[PDB]
Amino acid sequence: GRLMDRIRKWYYNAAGFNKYGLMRDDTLYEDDDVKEALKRLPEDLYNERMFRIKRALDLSLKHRILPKEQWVKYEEDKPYLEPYLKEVIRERLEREAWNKK
Amino acid sequence: AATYAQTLQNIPETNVTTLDNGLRVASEESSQPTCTVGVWIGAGSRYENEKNNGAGYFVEHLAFKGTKKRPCAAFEKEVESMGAHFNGYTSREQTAFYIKALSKDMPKVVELLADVVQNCALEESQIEKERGVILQELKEMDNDMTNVTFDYLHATAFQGTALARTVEGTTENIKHLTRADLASYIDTHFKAPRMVLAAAGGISHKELVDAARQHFSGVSFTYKEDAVPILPRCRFTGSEIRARDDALPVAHVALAVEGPGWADPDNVVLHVANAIIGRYDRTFGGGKHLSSRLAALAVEHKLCHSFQTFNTSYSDTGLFGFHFVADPLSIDDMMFCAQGEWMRLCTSTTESEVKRAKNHLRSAMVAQLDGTTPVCETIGSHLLNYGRRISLEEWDSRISAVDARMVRDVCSKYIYDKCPALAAVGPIEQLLDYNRIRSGMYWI
Amino acid sequence: PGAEDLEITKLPNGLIIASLENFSPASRIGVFIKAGSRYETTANLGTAHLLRLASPLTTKGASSFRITRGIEAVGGSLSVYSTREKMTYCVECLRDHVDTVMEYLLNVTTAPEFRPWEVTDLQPQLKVDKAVAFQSPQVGVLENLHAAAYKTALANPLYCPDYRIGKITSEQLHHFVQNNFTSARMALVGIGVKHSDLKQVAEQFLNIRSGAGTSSAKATYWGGEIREQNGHSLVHAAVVTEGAAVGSAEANAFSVLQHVLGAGPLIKRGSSVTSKLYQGVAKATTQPFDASAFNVNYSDSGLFGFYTISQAAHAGEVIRAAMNQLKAAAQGGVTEEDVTKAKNQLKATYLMSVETAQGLLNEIGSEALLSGTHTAPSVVAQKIDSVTSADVVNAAKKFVSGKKSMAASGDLGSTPFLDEL
Amino acid sequence: AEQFLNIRSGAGTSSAKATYWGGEIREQNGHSLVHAAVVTEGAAVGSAEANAFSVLQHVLGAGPLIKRGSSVTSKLYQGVAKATTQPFDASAFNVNYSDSGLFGFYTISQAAHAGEVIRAAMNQLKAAAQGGVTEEDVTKAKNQLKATYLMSVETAQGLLNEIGSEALLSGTHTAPSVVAQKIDSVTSADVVNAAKKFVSGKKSMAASGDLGSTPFLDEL
C-alpha cells in the first residue's frame, strides 16, 4: 500500500543514518550472508561503501554529523547490496534444503 | 526406450568350458570386428619364496623376447606385422599376458599366447640384459611415492609373510636369479589348472575353444598336476612403517584394515562404502560442492593434493583403506578428517549417501567393461578369483540390496576399533603417534 | 534385439544430431563445437582454456551447486576435452539418468552466467591445471612447436599463457561463447540413446541458434625453431613440416608414412622392427631413447615429422639418425610390403580406437561436425589401402623438401639446430 | 701487482669461437610497448671495419642530445617519425666483441604501430645502404662520435675503463689523436657499405611486448 510508503520515509528519517552519509545497506550488521555478499561487490561500489563508513566513523569519534545538505535523502539511497545479499541467501537456502534430502 | 533394467540382460552371456588338462576357456562374444584374448595365470609374488622373489617379474620381461619355435626378431616381427598389440603384467596373486588384435587373427593369436607361456626361450644372453633393465625400473619406480607407499603398506600390513613382498623383488634376487629358477618358476606355476584363456570381442566360443585344444596340449598324468595348491595364509598386523625424508616435496600416507577376500559378499558393501567417501585431487571441478564430505573439507581447508579410498582384495585376505598426498603441514588435519569419515561410516551413514554411492558404483562397474581388453580382464579375473563370471545383472542386484543400515554394520565389522596398518613416506613429522591414530578408530 | 543404423538429422539452424543406440547399460552424450585457442587473439589469449575449466560455474538454469550435486546424485560424470580447434562437453551416466544429466549439459553449453566473482575465484586455477599438465615435457615441446611452426590461429597455446592468468574477463568469456558456440558450429552426438529423443531435446531446448560468428584466421606457416635450455637429462625434440589437412586427399598418405616409420610400440618393453625410424635410430645411438612418427591433421593445415626423447649427450646422433631414416624413405626406401604392414596397423589401431565408449562417441562426433556425415567403416578401409607405394614415398619427400620448424626442451647442449640437419 | 698476485700464468679455458645462428625469438607478454631489435653480424673489436659502423651508427642516429627534443641529425628517428603517429624511439645498435659483433636498430613503439615503425626503420636503413648518405652526414657523425668519445672519459669510471680495455685487449694505449685520425679516416663509402652488409646479411631479430601487430624477420 501507499500508506507505510509514507511510514518508511518517516522511519527512514527517524533512524537518521543519512546524517552520517551512510546508505541503508551501509548499516547492515555483517553476519555470514552479508559477508559473502560484500565479497561480490564490484571494486568501485566496495571502495565507495568503504570510504562512506570510515567517514561516518570519523564523524562519530568527533561527535558530529554531516551538514543538512549532505544527508542522504530517502529516495536517493542506493540499495547496492540487497540484490547480492538476496542471492547469497537463496543459494544457501538451496544448499540447506538439498542437504536434508 | 530400452531401460537400464534390460540392457543388463541383452548382454551376451559368458561361455565357459574346461579342457581335460584343467585349463579353462571363457569368452563374451560381441559384434566387434576387433578384439582381445589372453591367458590369466593364477601366479604372483605371493607364490614366490624368499630366494626366488621376483622371478614372476623377470619372467614377465622375457615373455616377449622370444619362444623356442620362433626367436626374438621373428616373434616380434610376426606380431607387429599383423597389427596386434601384445601386453601383460604380473601382480602379487595374478599374472596375465593378453593380445589385442582383429577378430580374424583370433586363432593364430591363441597359438602365440600358448607358445609364450609354454615355450619361452629364456636365452642366456637376453637374461643378462633384462637384468640391468629390471634394475633400472627398480630405480625409476623408487621415485614413485604412491608405489613406494603401497609396497611399504603391504610390507608391514602383512609383515613376515608372502604378501609382504614387492612384485619386482629384491635387488639381490634380480642380480642373481638363474636361467634355472626362471625356468623352474614357469614350469612350476604356468600350468593349465591355474590358467584361463579369456576372450572378448567378435569371436566364436567354439573356434576359440578348439584352438586351445590344439595348442594348449600336454595332458597331466599324476593327480598332483591337477591339484590347485592352497596357499599358506598371510597374517595381518596392526603396525606402521615411517620412511622420513623431509627433502621430499609432499608426503604420502596410506592407512588400512584387513579385508575379507574375493569370496565374501561384503566386498560389495565395502565398495558402496568406499563410494560414499570417494576420491579427490586438485583438478576436480566440483570443488567445494563435491558430494564426498572428505573431498569437501579437503577443499575448504586445502587438506590434500589428492586422496583415494581403495578395497584391494586377495584370495584369502585384503586391504581396506585410503591414501592421501599432502603438504607437510596439513598431514594432520587431513588424516584427522579422513579417519573421522571412516568413523562416520560405522555410525551415521544416511540412506541419502548410499543411494548415491550405489549409482556411482553402478556406473563404476559398467565403466570396467568399456572395451575388449577390460571385458577380457574381468573374465580372466572373475573365473580365476570368483570361480566363474558374475554378470552386471547379478552385481546390480547385490548393490541394490545395500542400505545404510547394512553399510554401517559392515564397516563397523571391519573398521571399528581395529588396529590398522600405516605407511608414511616423506616429510611426515606432523602426522604422528600410532597411538593417536589408533584411538581415531572409535567414537563417531 | 540389438543392432543396426546410426541416424544423423541436420535441423533448421544447421545444428547436427548424431544418434546411435547400442543398448549399452550406459549412455554417453556430448556437445561437439568448433572452438579453441585457434580463435583467440593477442587480446583474449587463454580465454578458451578458462572457459574449459569454467564448466561447473552457475548457469541461468542450474547453480554451481546443483550442477555438481545433481550430476553426482546419479553417479554421473561431466567433462570438457579440447584441441586448438574443437571443444567437447560430454556427460556419462546410467541409461535411466540421461534426461537428468542432460539438463546440466544443456545449461553449461548454452546458458552460462560467468558471474564475476565465480570467475575471479576460478581464475587462479589455470595456474594449477596448467602446472599438472606441464609435468610431462611431452607437452612442453608441443606448445612451443605449434608456435614455431605457425604465425597465428594454431600457433596459439592450448594452455593460457602465464601473464594472462587472472586478467581474463567475464566479457571475454561471454563474447567468446556468443561468437563461437553457435548452432552451425555445434553437434549434439550421443551413444546409448534413441535418435528420436536426442532430436526432441536438441529442438525445443538448444537456444543459441544459427551463426558462424568469429571466423578463424587462416593458419599461415612460419617455420621457425624454438629451443629451451632447462637442464633435464632428457632432450625432447620434434622436427616437422607442413603436413596434410583434415580429410585432405594427401592425408592418409602420411598416416601410412607414419606407421611405416613407426608410431608407438605394440610389444611391452619390446623393440619395434616394423618401425624403420626406431630401428634406424637404434643402430645410431647406444643408450635408452624413443623416436616416433608425429602426425597432426587440422582444419586448414597439418603437421608431420618425428619426435625424439634421448639422453642429452646422444641427442645429436639420435635426431640426425632420425633424419637420414626419413630421407632414405623419401627415396623409394619403402617396400611394397612395408606399405602392406602399415596399412593394417592403421586399420587395426583405428578399429580398436572405437571399443572405448569415449573413442566411439568421438568418432561419430568429429564427422558429424567437420562434415555432417558418417563415413562407413569399410569406406575408410577402402580409403586407407588405396594408397600407393608412391603416395607414401612422396609424402616422405614433401618433408625432406619443405621448410622445417623444430622444437626442443632439455639440456640442449649437444642438440642440433634446424639449420644443421 | 707483482709481489702480491697468485693465480698464475696461462690462458686456461679458451672461449669457443662464436658462431652465428640468425634466429628470431619472440615474447608475447601483454605490454602496451613492443621492443624490437633487428640486427646482423657487425664488426669485431679492432676490425678496421668497426670505425665504419660506429659512424653509420651516428648517421642513423643513436641516443638524443636535446632534452625532449626531436633528432633531426638522426635519419632513422626522423624517418620513423614520418611513418608512425604515436610516441616511440628508435636507434642505432652497435656491439663490438672479441671475435664478432652486432649491428642494427632497436625500436620501442606502441603495440599497434609496431609494424609501421619497424618497417620504416628498415627502409631507412636500406635507403642509406644506397648512397643515401651525404658527405656531410658523414661529417656530422664523425664529430658526434669524437665528442661522445671524449665526454665518456670525464667520468673517473669512464677514463679508467678506457685505459683498461686497451691495456687488456691489446697491451697499449692508443693516443686520443690517433683514434681521431682513425675515426674521420672513414670514407663516405665505407659507411654506405656497412649499411649494405646489413641489408645483405642474415638478420636475427628479438621482440618482447604485445607482439600481435609486430612483424616476423621473414616479413622485412
Side-chain angles (χ1 to χ4, degrees), chain A, chain B residues 1-443, chain C, chain D:
Chain A
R2 289 180 60 171
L3 167 53
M4 52 267 282
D5 215 306
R6 294 244 176 181
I7 281 168
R8 293 172 195 274
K9 187 170 163 63
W10 169 69
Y11 183 66
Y12 178 95
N13 283 295
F17 45 80
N18 39 288
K19 292 201 179 61
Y20 289 92
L22 304 176
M23 302 295 238
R24 180 197 57 171
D25 292 26
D26 286 352
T27 76
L28 283 171
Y29 160 54
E30 294 186 50
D31 83 340
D32 284 353
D33 297 325
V34 176
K35 293 254 193 60
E36 182 58 13
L38 304 171
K39 287 174 197 158
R40 304 180 167 178
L41 295 184
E43 178 85 320
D44 47 53
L45 290 185
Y46 177 70
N47 281 315
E48 281 167 20
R49 160 247 177 59
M50 185 83 292
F51 174 76
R52 273 203 290 294
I53 287 181
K54 183 198 175 74
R55 211 234 284 97
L57 299 179
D58 173 284
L59 281 176
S60 206
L61 93 80
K62 289 173 161 72
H63 281 292
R64 300 304 141 70
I65 60 175
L66 290 178
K68 181 200 60 180
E69 309 101 66
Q70 279 156 298
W71 303 359
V72 176
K73 319 190 176 184
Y74 178 75
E75 48 281 305
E76 307 194 311
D77 184 284
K78 307 297 175 189
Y80 65 73
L81 196 66
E82 197 186 4
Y84 296 65
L85 177 52
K86 287 189 176 186
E87 182 64 7
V88 171
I89 299 185
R90 298 196 316 83
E91 288 173 343
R92 194 193 76 206
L93 290 164
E94 175 171 48
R95 307 193 301 265
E96 262 173 50
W98 183 291
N99 290 289
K100 302 183 179 183
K101 188 181 172 190
Chain B
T3 63
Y4 171 73
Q6 298 161 288
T7 51
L8 288 186
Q9 292 160 296
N10 252 57
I11 299 176
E13 194 168 70
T14 297
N15 310 297
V16 193
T17 57
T18 326
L19 309 192
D20 286 284
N21 51 321
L23 185 155
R24 282 146 292 167
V25 179
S27 64
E28 165 174 297
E29 180 157 33
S30 81
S31 162
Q32 271 231 278
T34 165
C35 71
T36 295
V37 301
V39 60
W40 270 274
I41 309 177
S45 52
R46 183 180 184 176
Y47 299 80
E48 311 175 322
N49 99 279
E50 162 253 322
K51 294 180 293 178
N52 83 345
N53 190 197
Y57 193 62
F58 208 134
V59 155
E60 193 219 69
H61 270 197
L62 291 167
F64 305 130
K65 308 298 152 265
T67 89
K68 282 174 177 175
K69 200 199 301 167
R70 67 202 81 171
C72 189
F75 178 38
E76 296 198 289
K77 186 185 173 184
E78 176 169 0
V79 185
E80 301 177 61
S81 46
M82 57 194 281
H85 294 171
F86 203 165
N87 187 67
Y89 65 79
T90 166
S91 86
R92 292 193 166 82
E93 275 198 332
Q94 190 171 307
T95 308
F97 304 91
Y98 59 79
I99 298 183
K100 290 189 58 54
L102 328 79
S103 298
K104 166 184 62 182
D105 308 313
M106 183 263 107
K108 156 107 290 184
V109 177
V110 177
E111 184 193 313
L112 296 160
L113 297 172
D115 187 35
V116 195
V117 297
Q118 296 172 175
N119 291 291
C120 170
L122 296 174
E123 204 65 14
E124 201 62 58
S125 50
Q126 192 76 59
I127 280 171
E128 288 318 298
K129 183 185 172 182
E130 294 306 312
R131 182 153 299 175
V133 161
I134 291 185
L135 272 194
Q136 253 316 312
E137 327 202 322
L138 283 194
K139 292 170 195 172
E140 304 174 322
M141 302 167 102
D142 213 44
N143 278 292
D144 175 17
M145 299 323 107
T146 330
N147 274 338
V148 181
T149 283
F150 281 84
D151 289 326
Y152 278 176
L153 176 58
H154 283 86
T156 195
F158 301 104
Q159 61 177 292
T161 75
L163 275 179
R165 295 201 166 83
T166 48
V167 179
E168 299 75 70
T170 314
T171 284
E172 293 307 289
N173 291 35
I174 252 57
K175 301 171 58 180
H176 307 302
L177 264 178
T178 299
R179 203 257 158 192
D181 338 64
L182 289 175
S184 169
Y185 181 92
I186 323 176
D187 302 298
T188 317
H189 302 290
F190 293 172
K191 290 190 175 186
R194 291 167 48 176
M195 306 201 253
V196 179
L197 192 71
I203 303 172
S204 177
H205 182 56
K206 304 182 189 182
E207 299 185 73
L208 174 61
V209 64
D210 280 309
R213 274 169 181 167
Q214 200 161 65
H215 312 82
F216 284 150
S217 56
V219 193
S220 29
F221 302 75
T222 59
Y223 64 115
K224 287 193 172 180
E225 288 171 53
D226 344 316
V228 44
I230 299 177
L231 270 163
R233 195 169 227 179
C234 277
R235 166 207 53 183
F236 189 71
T237 298
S239 67
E240 57 156 65
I241 176 174
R242 304 197 170 206
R244 184 174 178 181
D245 187 358
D246 286 326
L248 278 242
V250 311
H252 279 257
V253 172
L255 194 82
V257 290
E258 203 194 306
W262 288 119
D264 212 314
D266 298 326
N267 277 307
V268 187
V269 194
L270 285 191
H271 281 120
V272 176
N274 268 165
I276 305 175
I277 292 187
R279 51 172 193 145
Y280 170 86
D281 78 53
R282 276 183 309 166
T283 81
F284 278 56
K288 57 168 180 184
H289 292 130
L290 285 159
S291 304
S292 166
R293 300 161 66 82
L294 183 55
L297 318 185
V299 175
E300 177 186 54
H301 305 299
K302 316 304 193 315
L303 306 170
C304 59
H305 290 260
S306 63
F307 86 67
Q308 56 179 175
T309 56
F310 62 62
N311 181 19
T312 294
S313 286
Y314 279 147
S315 65
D316 62 358
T317 194
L319 292 179
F320 180 106
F322 62 77
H323 161 253
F324 60 76
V325 190
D327 300 296
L329 288 159
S330 52
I331 314 180
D332 202 64
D333 296 311
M334 180 57 216
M335 170 71 89
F336 170 81
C337 294
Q339 294 200 59
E341 295 311 301
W342 257 14
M343 287 305 113
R344 249 211 66 255
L345 280 169
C346 319
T347 56
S348 56
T349 301
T350 353
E351 290 298 328
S352 315
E353 307 192 305
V354 302
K355 189 250 182 57
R356 187 187 80 251
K358 295 160 68 177
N359 294 325
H360 176 64
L361 186 59
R362 287 200 184 78
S363 295
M365 65 175 178
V366 171
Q368 302 183 305
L369 303 165
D370 202 70
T372 44
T373 316
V375 176
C376 210
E377 175 64 64
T378 299
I379 284 172
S381 289
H382 272 217
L383 298 180
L384 202 49
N385 286 305
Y386 290 128
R388 66 172 194 291
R389 164 66 182 287
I390 304 178
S391 65
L392 284 188
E393 169 168 54
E394 203 195 315
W395 274 154
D396 199 289
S397 163
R398 296 178 158 293
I399 291 180
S400 293
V402 186
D403 63 280
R405 212 290 171 292
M406 187 156 128
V407 174
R408 291 194 299 272
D409 293 329
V410 183
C411 288
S412 302
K413 180 184 178 181
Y414 295 83
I415 310 176
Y416 205 83
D417 203 3
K418 293 303 172 97
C419 319
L422 167 76
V425 192
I428 54 188
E429 187 175 78
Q430 185 178 87
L431 160 81
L432 225 92
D433 191 4
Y434 185 88
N435 278 304
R436 298 300 285 276
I437 303 164
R438 177 67 182 60
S439 306
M441 301 299 291
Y442 60 91
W443 213 204
Chain C
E4 193 183 65
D5 99 82
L6 153 47
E7 293 152 59
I8 176 182
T9 296
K10 189 208 164 187
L11 289 184
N13 45 187
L15 174 74
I16 294 178
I17 304 180
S19 154
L20 162 53
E21 170 61 282
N22 72 337
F23 296 90
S24 177
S27 316
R28 156 95 165 185
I29 304 157
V31 169
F32 298 67
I33 306 171
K34 299 184 184 180
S37 70
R38 179 191 187 56
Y39 310 55
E40 279 177 14
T41 316
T42 188
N44 70 330
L45 285 170
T47 176
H49 180 172
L50 179 60
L51 183 60
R52 182 165 78 237
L53 316 185
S55 44
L57 300 175
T58 50
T59 62
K60 294 171 193 171
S63 48
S64 173
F65 180 66
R66 206 175 81 271
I67 299 173
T68 304
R69 290 297 187 74
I71 291 184
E72 289 208 306
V74 302
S77 72
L78 165 52
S79 26
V80 170
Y81 314 81
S82 63
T83 67
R84 319 210 168 198
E85 66 201 8
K86 79 88 173 184
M87 267 179 67
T88 324
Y89 291 63
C90 38
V91 310
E92 303 203 74
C93 72
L94 311 172
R95 305 186 72 70
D96 342 303
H97 305 303
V98 168
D99 43 298
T100 307
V101 181
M102 197 72 94
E103 165 179 39
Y104 310 102
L105 178 48
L106 176 180
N107 251 301
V108 177
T109 52
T110 89
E113 275 187 49
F114 303 161
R115 309 183 163 186
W117 53 93
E118 286 191 3
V119 176
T120 325
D121 293 335
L122 171 63
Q123 289 211 72
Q125 181 67 302
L126 294 169
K127 220 172 164 193
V128 155
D129 173 61
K130 178 165 174 178
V132 314
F134 276 61
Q135 298 222 81
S136 338
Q138 172 216 303
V139 70
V141 301
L142 291 216
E143 284 280 86
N144 295 304
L145 188 76
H146 280 67
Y150 294 60
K151 286 174 178 176
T152 32
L154 297 179
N156 280 336
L158 184 60
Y159 292 136
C160 164
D162 280 7
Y163 84 80
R164 282 199 59 63
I165 299 284
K167 289 169 179 175
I168 301 166
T169 76
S170 291
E171 274 89 308
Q172 291 195 305
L173 286 180
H174 285 107
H175 295 38
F176 188 98
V177 161
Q178 308 178 317
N179 305 309
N180 297 284
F181 284 33
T182 58
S183 82
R185 304 164 64 91
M186 296 168 65
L188 169 58
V189 196
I191 290 172
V193 290
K194 180 169 184 175
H195 199 103
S196 44
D197 308 302
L198 190 56
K199 183 174 185 175
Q200 163 191 54
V201 180
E203 293 184 58
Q204 166 185 40
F205 296 79
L206 290 189
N207 203 54
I208 210 161
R209 79 185 203 185
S210 42
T214 298
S215 289
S216 176
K218 281 282 194 175
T220 306
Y221 185 129
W222 175 15
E225 74 185 89
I226 298 171
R227 291 160 67 83
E228 168 177 345
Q229 177 57 59
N230 72 192
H232 256 58
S233 59
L234 290 190
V235 173
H236 283 222
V239 181
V240 309
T241 301
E242 180 72 68
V246 184
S248 182
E250 185 179 46
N252 309 223
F254 296 91
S255 306
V256 167
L257 170 51
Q258 186 185 202
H259 288 298
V260 170
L261 284 150
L266 313 188
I267 309 170
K268 185 180 182 181
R269 299 193 198 69
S271 180
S272 298
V273 190
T274 301
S275 179
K276 305 210 165 193
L277 186 55
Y278 208 136
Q279 285 303 333
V281 180
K283 307 182 190 297
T285 189
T286 335
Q287 304 315 316
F289 83 98
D290 180 55
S292 296
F294 182 72
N295 187 59
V296 207
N297 300 311
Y298 291 127
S299 69
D300 72 345
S301 180
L303 282 170
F304 182 96
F306 58 83
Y307 184 162
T308 70
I309 307 182
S310 57
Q311 293 196 181
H314 310 307
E317 33 172 287
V318 165
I319 314 178
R320 299 251 184 54
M323 272 274 75
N324 312 307
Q325 256 288 178
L326 232 178
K327 286 185 295 192
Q331 315 179 311
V334 186
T335 295
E336 195 52 56
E337 177 179 40
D338 310 346
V339 175
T340 293
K341 299 194 173 189
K343 279 181 181 175
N344 311 308
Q345 311 191 317
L346 189 50
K347 293 187 182 190
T349 273
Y350 162 80
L351 300 169
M352 302 180 287
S353 299
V354 199
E355 306 182 5
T356 306
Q358 165 241 62
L360 175 62
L361 176 70
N362 182 69
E363 195 48 29
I364 298 179
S366 295
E367 303 200 69
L369 195 85
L370 264 184
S371 190
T373 62
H374 169 277
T375 312
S378 66
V379 179
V380 50
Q382 162 210 303
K383 299 297 180 186
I384 190 287
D385 44 39
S386 67
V387 176
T388 74
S389 170
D391 282 311
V392 169
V393 186
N394 284 307
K397 296 179 183 170
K398 187 174 184 178
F399 179 94
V400 197
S401 55
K403 183 184 182 181
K404 291 81 169 188
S405 52
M406 176 210 236
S409 64
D411 182 313
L412 314 182
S414 296
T415 310
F417 291 82
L418 194 74
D419 74 54
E420 300 192 315
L421 309 187
Chain D
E2 53 170 53
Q3 182 194 46
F4 274 152
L5 302 184
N6 267 306
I7 312 178
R8 300 234 150 190
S9 58
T13 296
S14 288
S15 173
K17 280 282 195 176
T19 305
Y20 186 132
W21 174 16
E24 74 185 86
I25 298 170
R26 290 160 67 87
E27 171 176 343
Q28 177 53 58
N29 73 195
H31 256 57
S32 59
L33 291 187
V34 172
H35 284 225
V38 182
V39 309
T40 301
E41 195 120 55
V45 167
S47 174
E49 184 190 42
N51 293 299
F53 296 90
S54 304
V55 167
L56 169 48
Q57 188 186 201
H58 287 299
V59 171
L60 282 147
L65 314 189
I66 310 169
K67 185 178 182 183
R68 299 196 197 64
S70 180
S71 299
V72 191
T73 299
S74 179
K75 304 211 165 190
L76 184 57
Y77 207 139
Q78 284 304 335
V80 182
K82 304 184 191 297
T84 189
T85 336
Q86 302 317 313
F88 83 99
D89 181 53
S91 296
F93 180 72
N94 185 56
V95 208
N96 300 313
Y97 291 124
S98 61
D99 69 345
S100 182
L102 283 170
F103 183 99
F105 58 82
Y106 184 160
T107 73
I108 306 177
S109 58
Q110 291 195 184
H113 310 307
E116 32 171 290
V117 163
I118 313 177
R119 299 253 182 53
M122 271 278 68
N123 310 308
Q124 255 288 179
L125 233 178
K126 287 186 295 191
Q130 316 178 309
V133 185
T134 295
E135 195 53 56
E136 178 180 39
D137 309 347
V138 173
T139 291
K140 297 194 172 187
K142 281 179 180 176
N143 312 310
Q144 311 193 317
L145 189 49
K146 294 185 184 188
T148 271
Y149 163 80
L150 299 167
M151 305 178 280
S152 302
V153 198
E154 302 180 8
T155 305
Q157 167 241 59
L159 176 63
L160 177 69
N161 184 70
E162 194 49 28
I163 300 179
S165 298
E166 302 201 70
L168 197 84
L169 264 183
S170 189
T172 63
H173 171 275
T174 312
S177 70
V178 179
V179 49
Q181 162 208 302
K182 299 298 179 185
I183 189 288
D184 44 36
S185 68
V186 175
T187 73
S188 170
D190 284 311
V191 170
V192 185
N193 283 308
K196 294 177 185 172
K197 190 174 180 182
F198 178 97
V199 200
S200 54
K202 183 184 183 181
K203 292 81 171 187
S204 48
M205 176 210 237
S208 66
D210 183 313
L211 313 181
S213 298
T214 309
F216 291 83
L217 194 72
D218 73 51
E219 302 191 314
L220 308 189

